[PDB]
């Protein structure tokens, strides 16, 4: 951590964290403040594949001591981290606004998710329950224990730069594993600091190693490839489905079950009996929280025929009122810039794909500029990449309907009755989150058991999962793993079954078992006289 | 089992089952067919306190071998019992119609509950899970095991002569305990036969001992008193609150937690938006199943002001259509006789208590006789004790409102809105079952978290719990125990915590624990430049 | 389902089972009795990829009705299957001796494992527990449910033709999935019959579809490939690591977590303080049960220096006494033929690999023939492929030490003390089963926490897992999934998190949460004066 003054804070320069050492090796990258490109947040190196290799070997060297550290002591380290995150929450909030362009409200929420996670798993150090199981043989006892896997490879996005890494890092080390972490190039400073807070909390050197870099053709890819060298016993990834399937494949052949959170096209249904203003507010927040840059963001609002026109009218009213701007200078805004150029580009393209397939554009004029200004913009739109709130009407089966698009866009879709709403809600390659606004018990029930989704909200947004429920998707949104709560323990441990014999002889299950035979049946119809 | 021909079947004569032996000792009692007093079902002896003592000592002698029988083998015995109950279900159904006056439909249901219970616990023999727990010390392992208690004393009523004993007998023996069982004098034959089916399934002699007799001033009381001699490690009772509190007390001072299912005054709410015919049908069945002789039977129907008159009109219509009669000769009837004279007497008395406190009688003329006939009676009303379906309107705070009355009676009570419905529903000394009929998500939610009851039904009767949910009441309905499913394991086992040391030294929890200390905190506001 | 007389039973001819229909389509294969190749057990077709496609689509068409069948009713179907398997156990035992060459002792054990599994999961239909979870918000409730995946593709080996398919088939249908099953061409009749017993038990047509054929370049491969067409939501496989990695890869990219049981090289340690005769008997049975044709078979006996010579002497004595022969004509034999020619061939080659790398052959002369007879052979050794019991001494690091070889072979390896035994035990690509014979608490403990294995036995064989513990390996033996007991539910279900809102407002977790702030701290040192 060395300095040099920028305009919204110091420009930091730092290296990889490998075996406790800081390592400034590789071509320098930089992260610019997405709200103001003049402000340079960090300068950091790109780890080459040899350095990721070295990091995996430090992690391997650290595993023996860490796995033998009693789980309750490892949990005390996480408790130290709860206190330290609490202390640092205002500072991490402000750094997150500068580095990834989130609002202070949402940035604090993001940090809070990590605190919540750290408290849950601090206590989990005195749990991690296995089972005692009765043998079918005399003088024999059966047991199960949860054991750590080894070295975990972790790759994380930058839209939730503290929360979502915490879901992986914290349970991974709690359960006795060591970690190599390749964080997003969109949030290197936050990632560096987080790793230093784990260090402050007492995590031994080499249990967490941090290698900075890009993804495709860079450190991200190098690290996935190292699964073929046996240097990882586990892998976790948050990002695109397409990258996910590739990581699925590599891990697959190396007999690893990766944790894959892969995005979504999240349906939000509004039935004719819904509380309109509540549903409008829920649809709006589902679409525009984080400027539509969440895996869980609303993809399609499916609106019941009899309220379509009224809902549309009220929803456009609500969207028109959205404040957009530089969240450092204007904290009251709903959303600010795109996190990176990649997402801005895919978002630009969706306007063209929409027009080409016959979608109707109701609201939105693409990138906000001086030449193309937005009536409720606050700040300089040329200092970064900011998008008009965007609303379409679309038919099912179209690319705008089925394909994930990060950024401030949403589709309205007319449906008629509950059976159609469920079928249209399922007509996507995804199955992460979902939502229905209704007051009818029966309609909520049908949606709940008829949707194919990892997560459903009744009269609530598609966004804003609580930290202590299982998080994960079906279909193209993931592969069966769940994060958070007790459910993530399956991701970072394996079952060890033990049978202890005391009988002093070889006795064979299923063959020597001393099953008791019936006695002769009494003819009760005859005895009772029916 | 010796014979002598009655008119609906043989008259049986049998003794107590103690240590495998049949024991015909004590003054003879008899059970008459409640539908036809000319038909004698059984002749059986009253066990004296010395014989209950002897039975507890056989159970104690049998416990060493049975507790050491591997749980999966004990479960195979219950599996044998599933097959045998299945075989015998038509015969047990017909015996139950004759001996306790239930309809064939309800009698089969009763037997099915035992089959369901037997299957659940057969499989539980390979479960009974304890925990493996991580020590806070190195070279140390922690464990929990479920252990059997010892000898269980069980007293059961006769309104569910196969189902409710099965809830106690089956988990008790599965978990490695032995049993002394004092069954209802209203169902001695069913009880004898059930014990013989356990014998057929391979249960060793002395694991189940059966002592017949009465309750107060008889075998029931003798057996409760033996808790003061240390001959029981557990006790379970189904019956009246008043007897329950006394058993609570005796067990209390002997450091036993008894299982006490003690009856109820079960509220059923009908909100203004309810599906009327569904609620009417649910209220009717809640009131008149088993002729109102269930702990779970509806005590009070709380009806929302705007539908009061319409609901009343439709409910009286439905009650008037009830068929009452001899279920042996007329299986289509809803309910038949009272199970015993005691319940008939308390039911007679409620007419007088009602009139005296100002309740309004809407329907019912007390006992059905030739002089006082019921328009939809089928059979001879003088051959047994049968009651007019009975409906009152009552004020809260009255004896008819608060006090349990077995038999075919029910109260209507006008309430206005959800808050009042909840408060009036709670205005009873009981808290067993409960029900609300509504379509509004919010009203169901409020009732569900606002009621004080062990069990709640949304758009369903107060009766008809499924066999694999926890069954039990709060307030005067019980003391915290639950029967059925995984929840009953707490009733028949105790936790044994074991710590195994390998460290070769004395190391002290909370004092020697190797907790890790923080490193120095970095001033991040200053380093980042905020 | 039609006949033609062989010599040890009828020669059956049958087709695939697709949507209830029997379908005789594809080039005919045959299965010969491995103990006597003159006896033809079955003639059956090779399903082409289009027919597997058709089978997967029947399964998809059947899933709507089956998944909506209440879990307790699906469990009643399995209960029917428990009774039917019990009835058929003597017949299935005899068919299994004829079709795959196992001893009657082991064949009965195999069938029993399916009965055990069927009872466990029959009961599980009233369990399948999800969670209720407290919200951090007022007027909000959280829930988790277990949901079925869809259509399951299953490929099974023939060494455990009833037991190991039951581990997959039974939980898969219990949890609401439908199945396409490609059984081993070494046990088509057993597979056909088992499917017909599910049909007898009331399983609806199309919930289980059976497609016969081979593996690589045949039906096995066709079925793995269909994961790329979306026709399977899950896959389970028992066989070789090499095939497993490929299935890992295909499933990987299709975001599926396959269940992969992939074989092993199972260490059995004998410490200087062991009960010698007990360890000798455990090593012997671990090596030669099923003629060494189990994933769990002993690969290496690691013997502590001070007892090496004595153990070797006693072990060779014990091996010399092994009866080998035709189990149909001589049921008292320990093991009979190889299941198929493939395994015999790999086993023949291991003699050459051993000689070439310097292993010392202590016992064994390859294939038992009339020209090369075995002193304790019973029957005609030319009528099938039978192997001399085979014992080597080997160094760690060699092919005979590290590589799995199905068949009657075992290695002795000298180790010195517990640390070396653990290191040598881990020096293999595998981690399925493991075992140590010792009396010393501390040595058992060290092995238990030092071994890398899914399963460990203390003073018991590497073989003979009980049906109700989690079964599965680490390293090259699997990918994290476990079968049997509660642990297999993660394989055939996904978590559905539901949040229900009642607050009538949009309230944001992590941001609106009503956390309470501390009061000012009292200065207790000053107040107390200490």
Author numbering:
A (entry chain A), B (entry chain A), C (entry chain B): 1 to 530
Paper's wording?
The recombinant wild type crystals yielded a structure with a product molecule, propanoic acid, in monomer A and B. The product is ~6 Å from the catalytic thiol, which is in the attacking conformation, while the Glu261 can be observed in the “In” conformation in monomer B. Interestingly, the ligand, situated inside the aldehyde anchor loop within hydrogen bonding distance to Arg294, Thr296, Gly464 and Ala465, is observed in two different orientations. In monomer B, the carboxyl group of the propanoic acid is oriented toward the catalytic cysteine and is coordinated by hydrogen bonds with Arg294, Thr296 and Gly464. However, in monomer A the carboxyl group of the product is now oriented toward the aldehyde anchor loop and coordinated by the same residues as in monomer B in addition to Ala465 and Thr462 through a water-mediated hydrogen bond. Indeed, in the full-length recombinant protein Glu261 is observed in the “In” conformation, which may be indicative of an intermediate state depicting the molecule leaving the tunnel after catalysis, with repositioning of the glutamic acid. The different orientations of the product in monomers A and B is likely to provide snapshots of product handling throughout the aldehyde anchor loop. It is worthy to note that a similar product orientation was previously observed with ALDH1A336.
